[PDB]
């Protein structure tokens, strides 16, 4: 019972951006109010929980190309 | 019962942007309220839970350009 | 029962960006009010828990060019 | 040319009130967003003005029983 | 030419209230935003001028009765 | 030519308020934003301005029950 695998992607990729200029980005939140009442809680098992934010974000990269990849050979 | 497997994805792919110019962005968020209300709570696997959020973003980037790929073999 | 593999995952890749100029990016938030209440808390694997911020953020990488990979092969 | 002017107005007024309780009066404005955009003002006499509020008013006497009155004599 | 003036007002007025209990009274405002845009102003006179205010007020008098009055006499 | 002038304003005015109880009163502004904008000014008399206030008051008396008065007597 042979078993031969040749496992062999190849990539050749760019991911390019040019921007001529940024620039006059204003971001001027105005307040907020936020109010949550319980009781009780239990997480078990990977639990990413958020209770009650106020978040503000100014997020302004030049470049920002996101290039995600993912392999996953299994064998049995 | 020979077998033979061959996995060979080639790519060349190019993901480009050119922008002239990127300015005059405003946000300007005029408050709010929330109000939440609950008892009990029992999360038990890869919750991702969010309660209550006032969030505010501005994402600006100069490029942006996203490219996932996602490669999965599996043999039994 | 003869097992041979080969995993070779070629790659060349380049991920680029050219921003002429970033500037004049402003981010004033205007306050706010947050208000939380529980009695118990029972968190038992992996939690990633917030509870009640209040964050800003600005964030202003002259790159921020991201290329994450992952790789997992698995023999029995 | 004799003139003989009696100015005698009497007055005998209660103005009364009985509240048994006052309670659980909630006042929750959920925020707003106000622009006002001009060139020229030129105010002359007596102005009472205005422009661009965000008011908000939780007025809550245990009384609030108002008496106005005005005696205006002339001779000539 | 007599002239025999007699200005006798008179008053027994009582401004009564009764308010068994005060209490639980909430206020709660969610932000806000306001902007205002001119170039030129001339006040001359008795101005009394507000330009872009935020305000709140929670004004909870146990009493709370007025009483205005106002006698005017002239002669020419 | 006689002139005979009695100006005789009898009171006998109470004012009065009875409260049983103040309390539990909250006050919670969350936040705000303003932003006024002029090139020139000009105030010449009893001007009385606010410009971009962002104000909050409590006011909590106990009491509470105001008498303006005003007499004005003139002769010529």
Known sequence: ???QIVYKPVDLSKVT???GSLGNI???PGGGQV???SEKLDFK???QSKI???DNI???PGGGN???ETHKLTFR
């Open 1 to 3: 019972g042979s078993v």
């Open 17 to 19: 951006s040019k921007c």
């Open 26 to 28: 204003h971001h001027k």
């Open 35 to 37: 109010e949550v009442k």
């Open 45 to 47: 098992d990977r639990v």
């Open 52 to 54: 009650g934010s106020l």
């Open 58 to 60: 100014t997020h302004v």
């Open 66 to 68: 996101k290039k995600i």
